Amino acid sequence: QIQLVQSGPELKKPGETVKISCKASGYAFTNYGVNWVKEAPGKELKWMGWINIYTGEPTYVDDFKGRFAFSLETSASTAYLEINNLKNEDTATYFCTRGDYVNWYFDVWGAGTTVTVSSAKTTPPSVYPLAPGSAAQTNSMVTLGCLVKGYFPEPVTVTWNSGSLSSGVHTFPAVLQSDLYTLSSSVTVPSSPRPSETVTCNVAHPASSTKVDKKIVPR
Amino acid sequence: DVVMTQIPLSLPVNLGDQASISCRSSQSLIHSNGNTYLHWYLQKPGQSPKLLMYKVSNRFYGVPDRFSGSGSGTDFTLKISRVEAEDLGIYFCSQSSHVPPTFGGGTKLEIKRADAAPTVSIFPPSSEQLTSGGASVVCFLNNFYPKDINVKWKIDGSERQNGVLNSWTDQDSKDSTYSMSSTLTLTKDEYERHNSYTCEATHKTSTSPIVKSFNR
Numbered sequence A: 001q002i003q004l005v006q007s008g009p010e011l012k013k014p015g016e017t018v019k020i021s022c023k024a025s026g027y028a029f030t031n032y033g034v035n036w037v038k039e040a041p042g043k044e045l046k047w048m049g050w051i052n053i054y055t056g057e058p059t060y061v062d063d064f065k066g067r068f069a070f071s072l073e074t075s076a077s078t079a080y081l082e083i084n085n086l087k088n089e090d091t092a093t094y095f096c097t098r099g100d101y102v103n104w105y106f107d108v109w110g111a112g113t114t115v116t117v118s119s120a121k122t123t124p125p126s127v128y129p130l131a132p133g134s135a136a137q138t139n140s141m142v143t144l145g146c147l148v149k150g151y152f153p154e155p156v157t158v159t160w161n162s163g164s165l166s167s168g169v170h171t172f173p174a175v176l177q178s179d180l181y182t183l184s185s186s187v188t189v190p191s192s193p194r195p196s197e198t199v200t201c202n203v204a205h206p207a208s209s210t211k212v213d214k215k216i217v218p219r
Numbered sequence B: 001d002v003v004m005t006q007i008p009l010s011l012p013v014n015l016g017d018q019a020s021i022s023c024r025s026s027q028s029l030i031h032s033n034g035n036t037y038l039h040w041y042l043q044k045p046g047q048s049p050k051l052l053m054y055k056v057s058n059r060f061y062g063v064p065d066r067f068s069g070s071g072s073g074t075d076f077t078l079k080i081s082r083v084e085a086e087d088l089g090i091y092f093c094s095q096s097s098h099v100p101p102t103f104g105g106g107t108k109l110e111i112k113r114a115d116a117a118p119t120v121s122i123f124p125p126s127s128e129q130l131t132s133g134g135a136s137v138v139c140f141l142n143n144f145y146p147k148d149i150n151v152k153w154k155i156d157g158s159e160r161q162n163g164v165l166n167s168w169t170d171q172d173s174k175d176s177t178y179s180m181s182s183t184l185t186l187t188k189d190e191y192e193r194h195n196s197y198t199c200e201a202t203h204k205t206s207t208s209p210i211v212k213s214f215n216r
C-alpha cells in the first residue's frame, strides 16, 4: 500500500503557525522528491516548493518566502510544511506529492490537509423557518426550507424529518458573511403533506453541541 | 510562469460519447533534453488527483485503455474514447518543463441531459429573525439544467446589489440537474420601510424571465 500520509485538518487564527506532516511508507523515500502543492478555494493548483531528499535542500517558489518553511526528518520518513504568521489567504488544502527524477510527474499524492484560518469563535446557528409566504403552488407541490445563519466552524448536518425526507431535499453549500457561515436546505413535498403532515428540519452543529429542530408551520 | 489554460470549463457528455479536453501553453513544452513534459491529472470529487498521462502521450499504470494524448508545441488534447461513469471529474493538464511546474484551470466532465427550467420559490423573512433585527429574503432556483442562470433581485420596482449571496449545488446525481439559492439581506428596519420583493431568474428555458414575488 504505498501512500504519503498527511496529518489532519487544522483550524488556526492569524499569526499562529502550523506544522503539516507528510509521512512516506511503501517506497524508497530518498530517491524521489517531495513537492508541496496548494489548492485554494477557487484558485488553481499553485505549486509551492520541493525538497529533494539527496541534497536536503528546499527550492521554494518565492511567491512563498520566509513564512512557509519546508523541513524534513528523514530517519522517520516524514517531510513537513510549516507556515508562519498565517494570514487569511492560506485557507486551502495543501497536498504533498511524490515527484520523480526521470519523467518529472507527480504520481502518488497525499490526501490533503485543509488549513482554515479564521478569527470567529464558535457560534451556534440561528435556524429560521421558510414557509410559502402564502404564495400558492404552481404545480401540485410545495417547497419549504430552513435557513441556518451566522455559525462557525463547519460542518452543520441539516436533515429533514430525522432522515426520512431524502429525495427532494437540497442542502446548499455554506457561504461566509463576516467570519460566520450561512447555509440553507429545501424540501419539496406533495401538497397533500404540508400542512396536513408535519415537516421538521433538524440542524445539528457538532462543534458547539447544539441541535435545533424547527417545524415549518404556515405562512 | 508558463500559463496553461484549459477549455471548456465544463463538458456536457452523454456516457458513451467520445470526449476531448484541450489544454494550451504560453511557452513551449519541448525541453532542451528533447522531451515535452505535459502531464494530465484526474481529480474525482473530494479527493487528491490521480496521474493519467505523462510526456504527452503516455498512459500511467492501470489508467484505462480509452484515453489518448496528442499535440505538440503548445496545443495538446486528451481524448477519452467512450466515456464510462468513473472518468467523471475535473481534468487538469500541467507543464513540468519550466520551473515552476504550473497547472491548468481544469475541465469538469458532467453528464448532459434535456433542458429543464428552474422551479423557483421566494420566501419572506421569518418572524423569528425580524424579532432580532434582520430579514433575509430567500429565493431557491431548483431543479434546472443547464448550469448558467442569472438571478436579478428586483427589490422595490428597482434592482438590488448587496446582501445577495449565492451558492449552487453540484450536478445533482439523481437527475443530472442543478440548483441555486440566493439570499438578499436587509436590516429588519430597512426591510419594513418597503413594498414588494422579487427574485427574478433569466435562463435558456424561458422566453421571458421566470420571476416570483411577495410584498407586505
Ligand SMILES: CC(=O)[C@H]1CC[C@H]2[C@@H]3CCC4=CC(=O)CC[C@]4(C)[C@H]3[C@H](OC(=O)CCC(=O)O)C[C@]12C
Binding pocket: A032, A033, A034, A035, A050, A052, A055, A099, A100, A101, A104, A105, B031, B096, B097, B098, B099, B100, B101
Ligand atoms: C524528483 C522531483 O522532485 C521532481 C518533480 C518535478 C521535477 C522538476 C520539474 C521542474 C524542472 C524543470 C527542469 O527541466 C529542471 C529540473 C526540474 C527542477 C525538475 C527536477 O529535476 C532536477 O534535476 C532537480 C533535482 C536536482 O538535480 O537537484 C525534479 C523534480 C522537482
